[PDB]
Design a protein around this ligand. Structure first.
Ligand SMILES: *[C@@H]1O[C@H](CO)[C@@H](O[C@@H]2O[C@H](CO)[C@@H](O)[C@H](O)[C@H]2NC(C)=O)[C@H](O)[C@H]1NC(C)=O
Ligand SMILES: *[C@@H]1O[C@H](CO)[C@@H](O[C@@H]2O[C@H](CO)[C@@H](O)[C@H](O)[C@H]2NC(C)=O)[C@H](O)[C@H]1NC(C)=O
Ligand SMILES: *[C@@H]1O[C@H](CO)[C@@H](O[C@@H]2O[C@H](CO)[C@@H](O)[C@H](O)[C@H]2NC(C)=O)[C@H](O)[C@H]1NC(C)=O
Ligand SMILES: *[C@@H]1O[C@H](CO)[C@@H](O[C@@H]2O[C@H](CO)[C@@H](O)[C@H](O)[C@H]2NC(C)=O)[C@H](O)[C@H]1NC(C)=O
Ligand SMILES: *[C@@H]1O[C@H](CO)[C@@H](O)[C@H](O)[C@H]1NC(C)=O
Ligand SMILES: *[C@@H]1O[C@H](CO)[C@@H](O)[C@H](O)[C@H]1NC(C)=O
Ligand SMILES: *[C@@H]1O[C@H](CO)[C@@H](O)[C@H](O)[C@H]1NC(C)=O
Ligand SMILES: *[C@@H]1O[C@H](CO)[C@@H](O)[C@H](O)[C@H]1NC(C)=O
Ligand SMILES: *[C@@H]1O[C@H](CO)[C@@H](O)[C@H](O)[C@H]1NC(C)=O
Ligand SMILES: *[C@@H]1O[C@H](CO)[C@@H](O)[C@H](O)[C@H]1NC(C)=O
Ligand SMILES: *[C@@H]1O[C@H](CO)[C@@H](O)[C@H](O)[C@H]1NC(C)=O
Ligand SMILES: *[C@@H]1O[C@H](CO)[C@@H](O)[C@H](O)[C@H]1NC(C)=O
Lengths: 413, 270, 238, 208
C-alpha cells in the first residue's frame, strides 16, 4: 500500500491496493471411411487415376501418421501432426498404382512420363502424398501413359506401390471435415479453465438446477453471461458461477503509529486465502475480534469498524450512549444554569483557477503535430473555454460569500 | 484474466487507477450521506415503557419488537431491490437494522423531550404541553389545544391510519425511491451488455480473436475492443459522478429538513 | 504542478484582501449586530446587543445582565479553547485540505499521462517525429493525439463536476453568513449546535471558517407541572 | 386465395436458454397478421426463407424440392418423408413434370450427387415448418400442433449445404406458405425456457 499510494507514510484508515482471484486449476475439455481409401482391395491405373471426395465427418489423422503402415509419408502446408486440430471444407483423395522410382514424381514441380501424361499436380500445396509398398498383395494389370503397362514382378524401384494423394478444400464453403476434439474428464466445485467446444471461460462448474430443452447447448441470463451448459459429449447439464474474486484492502493506524496491519478481503467465504474472522463484508485477517462496542474509528462495512492496546481490533460500532429519558405526564425538566460555547464549521468556497493550453498540452512547439490537431476542430476551444468558465466563477464564489458588506467597518480602538 | 490484453492496458497509463478512484470517492461519499442525515443524536433515546402521550396514538410510528416500526416494514415491501465479472457492490456502513435505530431514537426524542433533545440535554416534558407550545409557535394561543385536546388527538390518529392505507393500498407512492434503484440497475445492466459489443472488431469475444490470429494482427483487433470498452467504462463512471452529485443534493436537503423540522419546529412556509 | 502548457491563475481577491472583509464583517456584528446587514449601521453597546440575542431565543433579557460576568468568562474561555483545539489537533481542516489535495491529484495525474505510450512506438512526440517520415509518423502521432485528447477530456469533465460541488458549498457558505453572521438564525441545528446567538467568519486559503456562539442549557432539575390552574372556577393559562 | 397468419411463425432463433426474461432479437421472421397464401403443386419463389404450414392429415404432402434450377443443371435437395424415416439428398436430380409421392418417380437422376442424410420421421392436426438459408448453412424449423393461436417452432437439423435455393416446389390436401422478413421481435421466454409470447416491433404503433 505504500507503493500503490506512492508514499513512505500512509495515514490511518482503510486503503484498497489490489484485487485477487482464485486461479483456475485442472482445466477440462468439452468418422470418414478412410478404410475404403487406404485398405481398398484394388487400385486403378495411373493414366486413369480415380478420386473420391471425402466429407461430412470428424476425421482422426493420427491413425495413418503415427504408425508405420506406409513407406512414404510426405505432407505439405501443415505439419502432419496438426491435421487433427484443423477443419476443412472438403477432402479429395486420388488413388493409383505406379512403379517405385516413379513415386518421387507425385509432387508439384516435377517432370517425366508420369508427371506430364499420367497424373499432374498443380503448382500449389497438397495435403499429404502417402505411398506404401504393394508387391506383397498386387504383383501387367496396370497401365501408364500412347499407354504402356508395368512389368511389376514379385522377384524395389520396379515394384508396385499404391499411392493416395489427399487434397483439402479451404474456406470455399462451411467446413465439413475436421479432426477430433480429444475431450478430457470434467470436475466439479472448483474454479477451472474450461473450453466447451467453442466456449473458453472460467468459473466453478457444479451440477445445475435449471432445466434445458432438447435443442439448447448452453444458456445465458443477461448480456451473453453464460449460466449453464449441457456437455455435448457426456450429455449432462452443469451450472457456471464465477470463482470468488474481489478487492483486498488493509487497515492501518498510520505508518508512524504502528506497522501493525490487517487485511480485508471483500465478499468471499473465508474458507481459503495469523488471525481469522468473518464479517458480513468479507473476512478479516490480523484483526482481533472483540465483543463490546465503541465509536466507529476505521469503517469496514455492515456496521463493523476497526488500534487499542498495541493491536488491531474489529468491532460492531455503538451508535451512542443508551439513555431513556423518564417520561412523566405530570412533570417537566428545566435548566437551572447555562453553558455558552463556540463551534467551528469549515466550508470551502474556491479552488485553484486551473487553465491549460491544449495546443501545447497535446503537441507543443511542433507545427506538424498541430496540423493534425486541426482535424479535431474545436475540442481545445471547448475544453479551454470550459476551464475558463469555472475559473471565472471561482472568483464569484469568494465575491459572493465574503463581499456582502456595503463598506469596510473599523473596530474602535 | 488475459495477459496479452493487459500488456495493451499499461500503454494507456493510469486510466484504470483514475476510474477506480472515482468510484471509490462516491462510495465513501455515500456512506457519509447516511451518516450526515440520520446521525443527528449522540445518544439512543428509548420510548418510555408506559405510553401515555396525552392520547396521541404512536404505536404504528414506533418500532414493534415482534420483528423496525410498522410503517417502515411497509416501506420495505414497496421497493424492488447484478454483477458477474469485474463488477461488485459494497455493503453500506450502516445496515438497515442499524439505521432504524437512529430513526427510532430521533422519533423517541421528539415525542418525549420536545425539541431540546437535539438542542442540548434532553428535557422530559408531557406531550400535551409540548404540543401546546408548538401551537403557540404557529400563532395559535396555547389554550386552544387543551380545550380541544380530545378532538386534536382523534384527528391525529385518524390521519396516521390514512397514510398506512395510502402507502399500502396505493402502489407507486414511492416513485422517488424506485427510480434510484431502477437507474442504478440500468447503469450496471447497460455496462454489462457492452461486453458483447464488437466496436468494429473481427469478434466481440477477446478469447476468440486472439485464439486464431497471430499477435501482430491480433493486437490491432484487441486494441479496438479495449478502446471501446474503456470508453464504455468511463461513460459509466461519468454518469455515476453526476448522479451521485444529485443524490448528494437530495441528501443535503434531507439533513436540513430533519434538523429543522424534526429536531425543532420550522417556521418557514411550505 | 504546472510545467508544460499548464498554469494556475491567481485569485482576484488576495489573502490579505479577503482578511479585510472578515475584519470588516465581524467588526460590524460586534458593534451593530443584525442591523448593519439591512441598512445603515447602528452602534449598540455590546452587552445590550447580547441581551437582545438572548431574548431572540426565548430567555428573559434580565438573565444576561444578572449573569453578565459569568457569560463573558465562559465566552472567553471558550474562544481560547478554539485557539488550542486547532493549534495541536491535526486534521483540524481536513474538509478544507481535501479540496487542495483533489486539485493537486488531478493535475499530477494529467501530467503523468504524457509518458503513456497509447500504443505508439514512443511516448515522446519529439522522438517519433525525429525518426519517421511524415507518412508513417502521422499514423503514430494520431494514436498519441487521440490518447492525450481523451486524457484532457477526462480532466475537464471531472473538473466541472468538482466545480459544481464547490458551487453548492459556496452557496451554502454564503447563505450561512447572511443569516448567522449578519443576523441571528432561528432555524435549529444550522449554525453549529444549540441555540444560535452569534457567529463570526474567519478566513482560510480556499474556504471560510465560522465560529458559532450558541446558548446551551445545562444543570436541569425535575419539576411537577400542570397544563393550567383553576381559581374561582376559571382555568388560568400561562 | 389469401388468409391471415395472426401471430404464427415464431421460432427459437438460437440454441440459447433464457428464463422469465424478455429478449429482443432480430431475424427473418414471418410478419404478424400477414397475407398467407392458402394453396389447395406449383413452383414458388423462395426469397430469403419460407414459412410453411399444413393441416391436411394425408400422406399426399410427402416432401419438397429445393434448388436453383431443379434439374440436372444444378444440385438440388429432394427432402422427402419416407414414412419410416426422413430422407434427404442433394444429388442432381432431373426435373419431373409431376412427381407423385403408392409409387415414387421423383429421383430421375443422381449425377455427381454429393450429400445424403437420414433421420427419424417427422409425421385436426396442424404442422408448421420454417426453412431458412443463412451463410451457406441451411436450417430447418418445425413443430407439431393438433390457424388461430400462438406457439413456437423448434429446430430439427442444420445442414451445411452452401447451395443457392430459389425454388421449392412441394411434392404431391392444403398447405399455407409465407415469406420471412428481417423483423425485430421481443421474444418472451417463460420460466421453463420456452417462448410463450412475442411482440412484432413494426406491426403497430403500440408494438413499436
Ligand atoms: C427526574 O426523575 C426521574 C425519575 O425519578 C429520574 O430518572 C431516573 O433517575 C435515576 C437516578 O439518576 C436513574 O437511576 C433512573 O434510571 C432514571 N430513570 C427512571 C428511574 O425512570 C431523572 O434522572 C430525574 N432527573 C434528574 C436530572 O434528576
Ligand atoms: C453555572 O455553571 C457555572 C460553570 O462555570 C458556574 O460558575 C462557576 O461556579 C463555581 C461555584 O460558584 C465557581 O467555583 C466557578 O469559578 C464558576 N465558574 C465560572 C467560569 O464563573 C455557576 O456558578 C453555575 N451557576 C449556577 C446557578 O449553578
Ligand atoms: C394505537 O393504534 C393501533 C393501531 O394499529 C392500535 O392497535 C390496534 O387496536 C385495534 C383495536 O383498537 C385492534 O383491532 C388492532 O388489532 C390493533 N393493532 C395492532 C395490535 O397492531 C392500538 O390499540 C392503539 N393504542 C392506543 C393506546 O390507542
Ligand atoms: C370542527 O371539526 C371537527 C372535526 O373536523 C368536529 O368534530 C367532530 O364532531 C362532529 C359532531 O360533533 C362529529 O360528527 C365528527 O365525527 C367529529 N369528528 C372528529 C374527528 O372528532 C367539530 O364538531 C367541528 N366543530 C367544532 C366547534 O369543533
Ligand atoms: C487396414 O487394416 C489393418 C489390419 O486390419 C489395420 O491395422 C489398419 O489400421 C487398417 N487401415 C485403416 C485405414 O483402417
Ligand atoms: C505520526 O505523525 C503525525 C504527524 O507528524 C502525528 O500527528 C502523530 O501523532 C504521529 N504518531 C505517532 C505515534 O508518533
Ligand atoms: C462457506 O461455505 C460453507 C459450505 O457451503 C458454509 O457452511 C459456510 O457457512 C460458508 N461461510 C459463510 C461465511 O457463508
Ligand atoms: C464474546 O461473546 C460470546 C457470546 O456468545 C462468547 O461466547 C465469547 O466467549 C465472548 N468472548 C469474549 C472475549 O468476550
Ligand atoms: C424407405 O423405407 C423403406 C422401408 O422402410 C426402405 O425400403 C427404403 O429404402 C427407404 N428409402 C427410400 C424409399 O428412399
Ligand atoms: C459436383 O457438384 C458440386 C456442387 O455444385 C461441385 O462443387 C463439384 O465441383 C462437382 N464435381 C463434379 C466432378 O461434377
Ligand atoms: C447464387 O447465384 C448468384 C447469381 O448471381 C451467384 O453469383 C452466387 O455465387 C450463387 N451462390 C452460390 C452459393 O452458388
Ligand atoms: C415450468 O414452469 C411451470 C410454471 O412456472 C412449473 O410449474 C414447472 O415445474 C416448470 N417445469 C416444467 C417444464 O414443467
Amino acid at each position: 500500500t505504500k507503493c500503490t499510494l506512492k508514499s513512505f507514510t500512509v495515514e490511518k484508515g482503510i486503503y484498497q491496493t489490489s484485487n485477487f482471484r482464485v486461479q483456475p486449476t485442472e482445466s477440462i475439455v468439452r468418422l470418414c471411411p478412410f478404410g475404403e481409401v487406404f485398405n481398398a482391395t484394388r487400385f486403378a491405373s495411373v493414366y486413369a487415376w480415380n478420386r473420391k471426395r471425402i466429407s461430412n465427418c470428424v476425421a482422426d489423422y493420427s491413425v495413418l501418421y503415427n504408425s508405420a503402415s506406409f513407406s512414404t509419408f510426405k505432407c505439405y502446408g501443415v505439419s502432419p501432426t496438426k491435421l487433427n486440430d484443423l477443419c476443412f471444407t472438403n477432402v479429395y483423395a486420388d488413388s493409383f498404382v505406379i512403379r517405385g522410382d516413379e513415386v518421387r514424381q507425385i509432387a508439384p514441380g516435377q517432370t517425366g512420363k508420369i508427371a506430364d501424361y499420367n497424373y499432374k499436380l498443380p503448382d500449389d500445396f497438397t495435403g499429404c502424398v502417402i505411398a506404401w509398398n504393394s508387391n506383397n498383395l498386387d504383383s501387367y494389370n496396370y497401365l501408364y501413359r500412347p499407354l504402356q503397362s508395368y512389368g511389376f514382378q514379385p522377384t524395389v524401384g520396379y515394384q508396385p506401390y499404391r499411392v493416395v494423394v489427399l487434397s483439402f478444400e479451404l474456406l470455399h464453403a462451411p467446413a465439413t471435415v475436421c479432426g477430433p476434439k480429444k475431450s478430457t474428464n470434467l470436475v466439479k466445485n472448483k474454479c477451472v479453465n474450461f473450453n466447451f467446444n467453442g466456449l473458453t471461460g472460467t468459473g466453478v462448474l457444479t451440477e445445475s438446477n435449471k432445466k434445458f430443452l432438447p435443442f439448447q447447448q448452453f444458456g445465458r441470463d443477461i448480456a451473453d453471461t453464460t449460466d449453464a451448459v449441457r456437455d455435448p459429449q457426456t450429455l449432462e447439464i452443469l451450472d457456471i458461477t464465477p470463482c470468488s474474486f474481489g478487492g483486498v484492502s488493509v487497515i492501518t493506524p498510520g505508518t508512524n503509529t504502528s506497522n501493525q496491519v490487517a487485511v480485508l478481503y471483500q465478499d468471499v467465504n473465508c474458507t481459503e486465502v495469523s488471525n481469522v474472522f468473518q464479517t458480513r463484508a468479507g473476512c478479516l485477517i490480523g484483526a482481533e475480534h472483540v465483543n463490546n462496542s465503541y465509536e466507529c474509528d476505521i469503517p469496514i462495512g455492515a456496521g463493523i469498524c476497526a488500534v487499542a492496546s498495541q493491536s488491531i481490533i474489529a468491532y460492531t460500532m455503538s451508535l451512542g450512549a443508551e439513555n431513556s429519558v423518564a417520561y412523566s405526564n405530570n412533570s417537566i425538566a428545566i435548566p437551572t444554569n447555562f453553558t455558552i460555547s463556540v463551534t467551528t464549521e469549515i466550508l470551502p468556497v474556491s479552488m485553484t483557477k486551473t487553465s491549460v493550453d491544449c495546443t501545447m498540452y497535446i503537441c507543443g512547439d511542433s507545427t506538424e503535430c498541430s496540423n493534425l490537431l486541426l482535424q479535431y476542430g474545436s475540442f481545445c476551444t471547448q475544453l479551454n473555454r470550459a476551464l475558463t468558465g469555472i475559473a471565472v466563477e471561482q472568483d464569484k464564489n469568494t465575491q459572493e460569500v465574503f463581499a456582502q458588506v456595503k463598506q469596510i467597518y473599523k473596530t474602535p480602538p | 484474466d488475459s495477459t496479452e490484453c493487459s500488456n495493451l492496458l499499461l500503454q494507456y497509463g493510469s486510466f484504470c487507477t483514475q476510474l477506480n478512484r472515482a468510484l471509490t470517492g462516491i462510495a465513501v461519499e455515500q456512506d457519509k450521506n447516511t451518516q450526515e442525515v440520520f446521525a443527528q443524536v449522540k445518544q439512543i433515546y428509548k420510548t418510555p415503557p408506559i405510553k401515555d402521550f396525552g392520547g396521541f396514538n404512536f404505536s404504528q410510528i414506533l418500532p414493534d419488537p415482534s420483528k423496525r416500526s410498522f410503517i417502515e416494514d411497509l416501506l420495505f415491501n414497496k421497493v424492488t431491490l447484478q454483477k458477474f465479472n469485474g463488477l461488485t457492490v459494497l455493503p453500506p456502513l450502516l445496515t438497515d437494522e442499524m439505521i432504524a435505530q437512529y430513526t427510532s431514537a430521533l422519533l423517541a426524542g421528539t415525542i418525549t423531550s420536545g425539541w431540546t433533545f437535539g438542542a442540548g440535554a434532553a428535557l422530559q416534558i408531557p406531550f400535551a404541553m409540548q404540543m401546546a407550545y408548538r401551537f403557540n409557535g404557529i400563532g395559535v394561543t396555547q389554550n386552544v389545544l387543551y380545550e380541544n385536546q380530545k378532538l386534536i388527538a382523534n384527528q391525529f390518529n385518524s390521519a396516521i391510519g390514512k397514510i398506512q392505507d395510502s402507502l399500502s393500498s396505493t402502489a407507486s407512492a414511492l416513485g422517488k425511491l424506485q427510480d434510484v434503484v431502477n437507474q442504478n440497475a440500468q447503469a450496471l445492466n447497460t455496462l454489462v451488455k457492452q461486453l458483447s459489443s464488437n466496436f468494429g472488431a473481427i469478434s466481440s469475444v477477446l478469447n476468440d480473436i486472439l485464439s486464431r490470429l497471430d499477435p501482430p494482427e491480433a493486437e490491432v483487433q484487441i486494441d479496438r475492443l479495449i478502446t471501446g470498452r474503456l470508453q464504455s467504462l468511463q461513460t459509466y463512471v461519468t454518469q455515476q459522478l453526476i448522479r451521485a452529485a444529485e443524490i448528494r443534493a437530495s441528501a443535503n436537503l434531507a439533513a436540513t429538513k430533519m434538523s429543522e423540522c424534526v429536531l425543532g419546529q420550522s417556521k418557514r412556509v411550505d | 504542478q504546472k510545467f508544460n502548457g499548464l498554469t494556475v491563475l491567481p485569485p482576484l481577491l488576495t489573502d490579505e484582501m479577503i482578511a479585510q472583509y472578515t475584519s470588516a464583517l465581524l467588526a460590524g456584528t460586534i458593534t451593530s449586530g443584525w442591523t448593519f446587514g439591512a441598512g445603515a449601521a447602528l452602534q449598540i453597546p455590546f452587552a445590550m446587543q447580547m441581551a437582545y440575542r438572548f431574548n431572540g431565543i426565548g430567555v428573559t433579557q434580565n438573565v444576561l445582565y444578572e449573569n453578565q460576568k459569568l457569560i463573558a468568562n465562559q465566552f472567553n474561555s471558550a474562544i481560547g479553547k478554539i485557539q488550542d483545539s486547532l493549534s495541536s489537533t491535526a486534521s483540524a481542516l481536513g474538509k478544507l485540505q481535501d479540496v487542495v489535495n483533489q486539485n493537486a491529484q488531478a493535475l499530477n495525474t494529467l501530467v503523468k499521462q504524457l509518458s503513456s505510450n497509447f500504443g505508439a512506438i514512443s511516448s515522446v512526440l519529439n522522438d517519433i517525429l525525429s525518426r519517421l517520415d511524415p507518412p508513417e509518423a502521422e499514423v503514430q502521432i494520431d494514436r498519441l493525439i487521440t490518447g492525450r485528447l481523451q486524457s484532457l477530456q477526462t480532466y475537464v469533465t471531472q473538473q466541472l463536476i468538482r466545480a459544481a460541488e464547490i458551487r453548492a458549498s459556496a452557496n451554502l457558505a454564503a447563505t450561512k453568513m447572511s443569516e448567522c453572521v449578519l443576523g441571528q438564525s432561528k432555524r435549529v441545528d444550522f449554525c453549529g449546535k444549540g441555540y444560535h446567538l452569534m457567529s463570526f467568519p474567519q478566513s482560510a486559503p480556499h474556504g471560510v471558517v465560522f465560529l458559532h456562539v450558541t446558548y446551551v442549557p445545562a444543570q436541569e432539575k425535575n419539576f411537577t407541572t400542570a397544563p393550567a390552574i383553576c381559581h374561582d372556577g376559571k382555568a388560568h393559562f400561562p | 386465395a389469401y388468409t391471415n397468419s395472426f401471430t404464427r411463425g415464431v421460432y427459437y432463433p438460437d440454441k440459447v436458454f433464457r428464463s422469465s426474461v424478455l429478449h429482443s432479437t432480430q431475424d427473418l421472421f414471418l410478419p404478424f397478421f400477414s397475407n398467407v397464401t392458402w394453396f389447395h403443386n406449383p413452383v414458388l419463389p423462395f426469397n430469403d426463407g419460407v414459412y410453411f404450414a399444413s393441416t391436411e392429415k394425408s400422406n399426399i404432402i410427402r416432401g419438397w424440392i429445393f434448388g436453383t434450377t431443379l434439374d440436372s443443371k444444378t444440385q438440388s435437395l429432394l427432402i422427402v418423408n419416407n414414412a419410416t424415416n426422413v430422407v434427404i439428398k442433394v444429388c442432381e436430380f432431373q426435373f419431373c413434370n409431376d412427381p407423385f409421392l403408392s409409387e415414387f418417380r421423383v429421383y430421375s437422376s443422381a449425377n455427381n450427387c454429393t450429400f445424403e442424410y437420414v433421420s427419424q420421421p417427422f409425421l385436426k392436426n396442424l404442422r408448421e415448418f420454417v426453412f431458412k438459408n443463412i451463410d451457406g448453412y441451411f436450417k430447418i424449423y418445425s413443430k407439431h400442433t393438433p390457424p388461430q393461436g400462438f406457439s413456437a417452432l423448434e429446430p430439427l437439423v442444420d445442414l451445411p449445404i452452401g447451395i443457392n435455393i430459389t425454388r421449392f416446389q412441394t411434392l404431391l390436401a392444403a398447405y399455407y406458405v409465407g415469406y420471412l422478413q428481417p423483423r425485430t421481435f421481443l421474444l418472451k421466454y417463460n420460466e421453463n425456457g420456452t417462448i410463450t409470447d412475442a411482440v412484432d416491433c413494426a406491426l403497430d404503433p403500440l408494438s413499436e
